[PDB]
Design a protein around this nucleic acid. Structure first.
Ligand SMILES: [Mg+2]
Ligand SMILES: [Mg+2]
Ligand SMILES: [Mg+2]
Ligand SMILES: [Mg+2]
Ligand SMILES: [Mg+2]
Ligand SMILES: [Mg+2]
Ligand SMILES: [Mg+2]
Ligand SMILES: [Mg+2]
Ligand SMILES: [Mg+2]
Ligand SMILES: [Mg+2]
Ligand SMILES: [Mg+2]
Ligand SMILES: [Mg+2]
Ligand SMILES: [Mg+2]
Ligand SMILES: [Mg+2]
Ligand SMILES: [Mg+2]
Ligand SMILES: [Mg+2]
Ligand SMILES: [Mg+2]
Ligand SMILES: [Mg+2]
Ligand SMILES: [Mg+2]
Ligand SMILES: [Mg+2]
Ligand SMILES: [Mg+2]
Ligand SMILES: [Mg+2]
Ligand SMILES: [Mg+2]
Ligand SMILES: [Mg+2]
Ligand SMILES: [Mg+2]
Ligand SMILES: [Mg+2]
Ligand SMILES: [Mg+2]
Ligand SMILES: [Mg+2]
Ligand SMILES: [Mg+2]
Ligand SMILES: [Mg+2]
Ligand SMILES: [Mg+2]
Ligand SMILES: [Mg+2]
Lengths: 81, 132, 116, 328, 208
RNA sequence: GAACAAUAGUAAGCACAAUCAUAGCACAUAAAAACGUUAGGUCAAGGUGUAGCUUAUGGGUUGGAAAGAAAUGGGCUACA
RNA sequence: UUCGCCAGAGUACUACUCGCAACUGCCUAAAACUCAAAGGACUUGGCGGUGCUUCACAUCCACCUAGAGGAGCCUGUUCUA
RNA sequence: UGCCAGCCACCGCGGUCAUACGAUUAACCCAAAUUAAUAGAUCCACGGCGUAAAGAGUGUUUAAGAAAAAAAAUCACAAU
């Protein structure tokens, strides 16, 4: 969740329902959010543009890096035999 | 509420033939006529005779082929011969079907004093138009 | 400035005696009310009375006073035109404020939190 | 349901071959147009509803469009918006908004370079251009939509077109264009006619309320009118009907200049006057200028009068009038 | 309503279409009329391009008509106009040059003027308040007033004549008497006006 | 169990809607109108559950069914 | 931490007691008997001679036209028969 | 049988298709006993008192109790 709230300022439904579904949840919890049901919360500012752009970029890079590492280790496993 | 020749809505499980799913106001619009004969045309005669004949045929056929009749009969009358056409469930062995074909055609031919043809179309289970 | 709410309502903690007994709880609602349509009153009554005096005096011959008849007519026309044309513009333009629909939407975009 | 479609196409082709054979035609030059005549002749169903009659058609037209499979065999959904529940619509919104941003960027660079080189393509009005209906859009995404959805999208396209239009942008918004067909109410002028050394006669046919009227007018004659072989003062004793006959001529100031013969049948006297009125009006359009035709139409001279007797209804008295209703 | 709301009423006036070139806003207006691809209701049988037809005379004709008889009501109107005409031609030749300058012989202008004089200024509507029905002075629309005039004319010259007496006779009489303001119709108008002054206080009960 | 600058709802089905009819459109009219409500109406259309009759509550023949103190509904013809 | 109160509903702010400047009073306060409930809060309906908006298109008021209710007949009810 | 005759500890049953009455058939359960009636045993609150029964119209003291660790008596306004 890049914002844990919905435009009416209650918690986004998906939080309660992801919990309900046994799905782990990362989310950026601003100062007025409720972190409780969120698996790995990262406290910080969700409202300002450089912040959201930052968090987007980070999660992007992490994902891309992982998918790469998986490709490379797969290749290695293919040459192993 | 008009009730005539209607099949009311059930809980939504009810199998309904193409015929039964169309209320009388749809005749000649969507579904067609279960009989055909000259009698009801403008300048023509003996409508009454053919109506009674019709009624007896539906009853007779329904009793002669118990349980195996799929949909209501189709009665085509052409130049003094009647072709009856029926939708039949497969129940009986073809022995019983041919026995009843021959028996019927002869019986009715001698009853109504005209050549009678019988045409059976066979079907696995009642064709289902709606719900189900 | 809003009137003070401190000490006013009857509560387990409050030392003194109630000042307000609110009929229904004081919690800002998420919508406003709908504007009350204006009570009508008779129109043209003055011009009518003037014409009626003119008649009572001149013994109800219409030829005698053409001015007050014509002016009562003119006025009734201005009251018809008023009834027709004022309805729409009083129903849209609130002047400095917004139509209650827009207010309600605006208030649902930033609602009150009684809960949590 | 893909195997179905494949099979159905196989058997539609085999069948189209068969049909072309019995109808005795070349299997190659057989069209849908021909298939139709062939069935209509082979299985002749009178039924008033055209959708209930026998049909052999290409299964793509018969069957409704299908949402394709949304994910691979591993479970990963193909399109990144899948979980929105409407991928089709929100993609459209995504790319539309993207093109809007693009336009804004490019046009801002061109604002800083002192260039407004674009034009407003937003007026297609002579082409009779309109937006898609909701139905059309719904058919283009193969997905159900909501009224507020359609509204949102259209509003966005509007935002787009209201800016400087790029080439790919113009092309983009123009998928969502349709053109409303011809709008002209101008009549179809009867070609004037010259018969047996006689010059300039025109024809017209009115119909009003159980009365039919055929009127032939000669431009070369003096003023008189012969209805069913007799004079119009004799056939139409009532002033009102003579005035009705007078209306179109007096309107065009042709009142002395034309000579007419009429055949009118059915209806009463007033209905016949009305019929001849309309027919005369329609006949005089050959002799007059194209502008005065528009005038006659705008006087309501050229329109048939649709008002006709309503059918009496069972359980009432008069087609409107009800039997007396007793409260208690 | 065999016409959809799409269909506009026709404009029968010939003068309007004949002389367009001097008016800008009206050129624009009827441009928008036809070019809108606008549908037009077919011009009614009653209404004509005739230079001779007075819409007021036609209305009156209609309000006189019983059953379906236009022929009979148009007869009675025609006869009445002719009767007023000849009554004034009688009053003209038995008079002197002064009164020959004064007296009106156009039956049309007489009809119109006699209706203008007979139309009420003010009117009465019943209003329920506190379980009582008060009669209250109400200003009237134009159409309502013209209607009241015509209807009062016809009601009187139907009702109060002696059975021997024909309609165009009695009607021409009352037209001429209402021309000069001494007719019983006019007395009715005054009864209304007086009932409206008697109740003038109650003018407050009217909320519109 | 809604909020569209959207806050928990998706829903097939039946109705409405659309189409069909009234011989071209359109409009109108016709038709259509679910689930239920009124133990609404009809065992005398026919068929039937339960309960009743069987030299009779069944089957036939012949002849009779009147009538206006009064009250009233809907119409027709009028009063010109 | 205390104190005052409360053991179904009625019967009952009653009957009897004691006390009281109260004498149609206040206070204190039962039982026979009767019942299988009596109560508290809510929910969905329905309803409201409750308020606020919006309407009615032959439709309530305002208004238009033709009729019924009075007569003779025609035909159906109710009674009486 | 038909709101009758009757039945029931409590809820209730009987108005023509009564597993509830009365009798029959089958069953169940106790058993030299089995039901009914009456008395016991048991059973109320270490719970409660805004709306259900219940904070006594007010304050002071008496009797009796608690003190269980840290401080306090006191200033615009319509007490009497
Ligand atoms: Mg924030
Ligand atoms: Mg105090
Ligand atoms: Mg309250
Ligand atoms: Mg009629
Ligand atoms: Mg559904
Ligand atoms: Mg059609
Ligand atoms: Mg329609
Ligand atoms: Mg109907
Ligand atoms: Mg429909
Ligand atoms: Mg009943
Ligand atoms: Mg009954
Ligand atoms: Mg029976
Ligand atoms: Mg009677
Ligand atoms: Mg009737
Ligand atoms: Mg207790
Ligand atoms: Mg007690
Ligand atoms: Mg007391
Ligand atoms: Mg006492
Ligand atoms: Mg005592
Ligand atoms: Mg009415
Ligand atoms: Mg009558
Ligand atoms: Mg009457
Ligand atoms: Mg009568
Ligand atoms: Mg009877
Ligand atoms: Mg017993
Ligand atoms: Mg029994
Ligand atoms: Mg028992
Ligand atoms: Mg028993
Ligand atoms: Mg023992
Ligand atoms: Mg209490
Ligand atoms: Mg207290
Ligand atoms: Mg007290």
């Amino acid at each position: 969740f890049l914002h844990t709230l919905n435009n009416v300022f209650e918690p986004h439904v998906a939080v309660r329902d992801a919990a309900k579904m046994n799905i782990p949840t990362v989310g950026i919890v601003d100062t007025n959010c409720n972190p409780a049901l969120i698996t790995y919360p990262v406290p910080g500012n969700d409202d300002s543009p450089p912040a959201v752009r930052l968090f987007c970029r980070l999660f992007q890079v992490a994902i891309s890096r992982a998918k790469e590492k998986r490709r490379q280790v797969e290749a290695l496993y293919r040459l192993q035999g | 509420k008009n009730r005539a020749a209607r099949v009311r809505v059930s809980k939504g499980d009810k199998p309904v033939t193409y015929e039964e799913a169309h209320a009388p106001h749809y005749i000649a619009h969507r579904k067609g006529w279960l009989s055909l004969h000259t009698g009801n045309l403008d300048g023509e005669d003996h409508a009454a005779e053919r109506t009674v004949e019709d009624v007896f045929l539906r009853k007779f056929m329904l009793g002669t082929f118990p349980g195996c009749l799929a949909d209501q009969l189709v009665l085509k009358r052409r130049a003094n011969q009647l072709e009856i056409c029926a939708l039949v469930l497969r129940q009986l062995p073809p022995h019983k079907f041919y026995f009843l074909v021959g028996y019927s055609e002869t019986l009715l031919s001698h009853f109504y004093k005209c050549p009678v043809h019988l045409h059976l179309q066979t079907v696995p289970s009642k064709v289902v138009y709606k719900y189900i | 400035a809003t009137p003070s709410l401190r000490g006013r309502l009857a509560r387990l903690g409050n030392p003194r005696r109630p000042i307000l007994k609110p009929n229904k709880p004081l919690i800002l609602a998420n919508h406003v009310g709908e504007r009350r349509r204006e009570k009508g009153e008779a129109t043209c009554i003055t011009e009518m009375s003037v014409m009626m005096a003119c008649w009572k005096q001149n013994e109800f011959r219409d030829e005698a006073c053409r001015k007050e008849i014509q002016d009562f007519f003119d006025c009734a026309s201005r009251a018809e035109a008023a009834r027709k044309m004022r309805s729409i513009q009083e129903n849209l333009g609130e002047l400095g404020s917004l139509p209650p629909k827009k207010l309600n939407k605006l208030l649902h975009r930033f609602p009150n939190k009684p809960h949590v | 349901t893909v195997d179905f479609i494949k099979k159905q196409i196989e058997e539609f082709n085999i069948g189209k071959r068969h049909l072309a054979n019995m109808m005795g035609e070349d299997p190659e030059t057989f069209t849908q147009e021909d298939i139709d005549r062939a069935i209509a002749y082979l299985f002749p169903s009178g039924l008033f509803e055209k959708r209930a009659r026998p049909i052999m058609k290409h299964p793509e037209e018969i069957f409704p469009k299908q949402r394709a499979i949304q994910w691979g065999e591993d479970g990963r959904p193909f399109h990144f918006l899948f979980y929105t529940g409407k991928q089709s619509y929100y993609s459209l919104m995504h790319d539309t908004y993207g093109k809007l941003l693009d336009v804004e960027k490019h046009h801002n660079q061109l604002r800083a370079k002192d260039l407004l080189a674009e034009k407003t393509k937003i007026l297609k009005d002579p082409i009779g251009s309109r937006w898609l209906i909701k139905e059309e859009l719904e058919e283009m995404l193969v997905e159900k939509l909501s009224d507020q959805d359609y509204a949102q999208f259209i509003r966005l396209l509007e935002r787009l077109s209201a800016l400087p239009c790029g080439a790919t942008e113009e092309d983009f918004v123009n998928r969502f264009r349709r053109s409303i067909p011809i709008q002209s109410k101008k009549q179809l002028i009867e070609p004037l006619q010259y018969d047996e050394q006689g010059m300039a006669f025109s024809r017209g046919e009115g119909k009003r309320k159980t009365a039919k009227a055929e009127v032939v007018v000669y431009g070369q004659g003096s003023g008189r009118i012969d209805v069913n072989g007799v004079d119009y003062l004799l056939y139409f004793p009532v002033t009102q009907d003579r005035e009705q006959l007078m209306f179109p001529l007096h309107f065009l100031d042709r009142l002395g200049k034309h000579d007419m013969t009429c055949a009118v049948s059915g209806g009463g006297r007033s209905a016949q006057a009305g019929a001849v009125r309309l027919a005369m009006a329609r006949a005089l359009c050959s002799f007059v200028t194209e502008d005065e035709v528009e005038w006659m139409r705008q006087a309501g001279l050229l329109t048939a009068d649709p008002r006709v007797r309503e059918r009496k209804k069972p359980g009432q008295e008069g087609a409107r009038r009800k039997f007396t209703w007793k409260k208690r | 309503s065999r016409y959809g709301p799409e269909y506009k009423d026709p404009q029968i006036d010939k003068e309007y279409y004949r002389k367009p070139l001097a008016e800008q806003t009206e050129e624009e207006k009827y441009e928008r009329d036809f070019k809108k691809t606008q549908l037009i209701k077919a011009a009614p049988a009653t209404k004509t391009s005739s230079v001779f037809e007075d819409p007021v005379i036609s209305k009156f004709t209609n309000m006189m008509m019983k059953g379906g008889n236009k022929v009979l009501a148009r007869s009675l109107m025609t006869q009445t106009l002719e009767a007023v005409k000849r009554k004034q031609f009688a009053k003209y030749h038995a008079a002197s040059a002064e009164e020959q300058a004064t007296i009106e012989r156009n039956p049309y202008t007489i009809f119109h003027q006699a209706l203008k004089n007979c139309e009420p200024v003010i009117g009465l509507v019943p209003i329920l308040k506190g379980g009582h029905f008060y009669q209250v002075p109400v200003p009237l629309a134009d159409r309502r007033r013209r209607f009241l005039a015509m209807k009062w004319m016809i009601a009187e010259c139907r009702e109060k004549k002696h059975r021997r007496v024909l309609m165009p006779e009695k009607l021409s009489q009352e037209l001429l008497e209402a021309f000069h303001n001494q007719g019983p119709v006019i007395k009715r108008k005054h009864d209304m006006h007086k009932m409206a002054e008697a109740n003038r206080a109650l003018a407050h009960y009217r909320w519109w």
